[PDB]
Amino acid sequence: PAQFPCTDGTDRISCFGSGSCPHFLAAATKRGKICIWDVSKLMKVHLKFEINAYDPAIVQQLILSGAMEVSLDITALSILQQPFPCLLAGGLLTYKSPATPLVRRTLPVLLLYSIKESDVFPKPGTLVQCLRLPKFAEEENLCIDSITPCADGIHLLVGLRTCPVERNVSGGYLVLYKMNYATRIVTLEEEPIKIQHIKDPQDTITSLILLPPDILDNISTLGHLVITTQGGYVKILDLSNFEILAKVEPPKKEGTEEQDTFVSVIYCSGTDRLCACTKGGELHFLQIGG
Amino acid sequence: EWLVLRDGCMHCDADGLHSLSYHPALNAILAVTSRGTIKVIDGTSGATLQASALSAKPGGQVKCQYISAVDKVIFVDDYAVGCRKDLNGILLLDTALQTPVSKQDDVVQLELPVTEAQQLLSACLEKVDISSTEGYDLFITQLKDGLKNTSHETAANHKVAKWATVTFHLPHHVLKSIASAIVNELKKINQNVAALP
């Protein structure tokens, strides 16, 4: 059966996903409660905790950014492992600050939580690392859309997007981070190893996939990344520099000239092709190599 | 400049598609429609395998993802998360996001394949006599209509036949009593048939 993240069964799930250690499946609610299940084994309760937005590391990061009201909402979930695995949550903190009337400012950060229980190591459910995103994420009020570990296992990719509110519009940012394994806990580095800007609002990233390099075998390269835009332009880029290497225009809808924009893309090994879903429900197979 | 080849397209549904997921073991594309249904399409001939609704609440935003490291499929709605895997070459996606019931009298969805249903019907009509049990007539009629609807699609495509499952909407205690009676009746006769497992 499908178990609810909480025993009440009334909270709605905000985000989910898997990272470099996908044996555990995470589910976070909008109120700040995360349940992790051991889906690799029999379906059981593996961890269950609630995120407090008033953590001392979060408080000092918000102090360094600028009663006191903080609302934290998770927008992406990932689990990073090389050394027990840890949960990486992409959170957004909204807080009232004086204008230099109070203004609600949003800041995206990354929170690291312990997963494996004790058999001064940190207890599960507590913060491990509070990574602060650079200034352009806070200036444009961006939110963490997607978190994906790279195929090498040493680098991580974060794709952002413009957070809607309940100028030059940007399509998001691609932040490539370097994994840190100096200590016994999986952590991240404060300095991003790559920053890529999407100056085109039309090129907002909606879905991404990674291509193994051995398909091309029929600074080391980090494979290829296939992304779908809002307008349906499939972009295949090298992960080393995020340069547009291959461009696929969206197809036209039948019976008209409307853009049948691609929304999501996957890789089909049997057809050996990029299978992408259109706006009208069609499926298109793109072949690589010739 | 990299070269990308286009060799056509296919039509899956007229309701639109939002998210995609591919299962590498069965070569099956799990297309997610905008109405919540999951359309399972074969990746070897262009013929669609099955359609599913996950037995979830109507209007929910179904999001499907695949993991090849653990070989598991995750379905996330606004309420709960379900995990599925391969079983005898098909995915049992009818009750993927079934909410666990709290009482014995709650109606539960029971999805079964074709060979198992045929063995159950053969045992119930030839070797098992459970006419005295509660809900026996309803289960026999449901099995009969499911098999007579499946057998028309059986002779056309084998993969679509195997992916097609019969969904019984029956109470939990009635089904439990029926299955216990089947187990007891097959155990007292010492007959090793395929309907017992």
């Binding site: 197979f285 | 056509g8 074969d42 001939s45």
Partner: peptide, 27 residues
């Protein structure tokens, strides 16, 4: 037999349907 990619003494008729794309046998 080579499995065909999806579109985007006499042998048995199923093998005759894919006789051109054969890759082993008959044995």
């Amino acid at each position: 037999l080579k499995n065909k990619a999806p579109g985007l003494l006499r042998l048995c008729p199923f093998l005759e349907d894919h006789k051109e794309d054969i890759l082993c046998g008959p044995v």
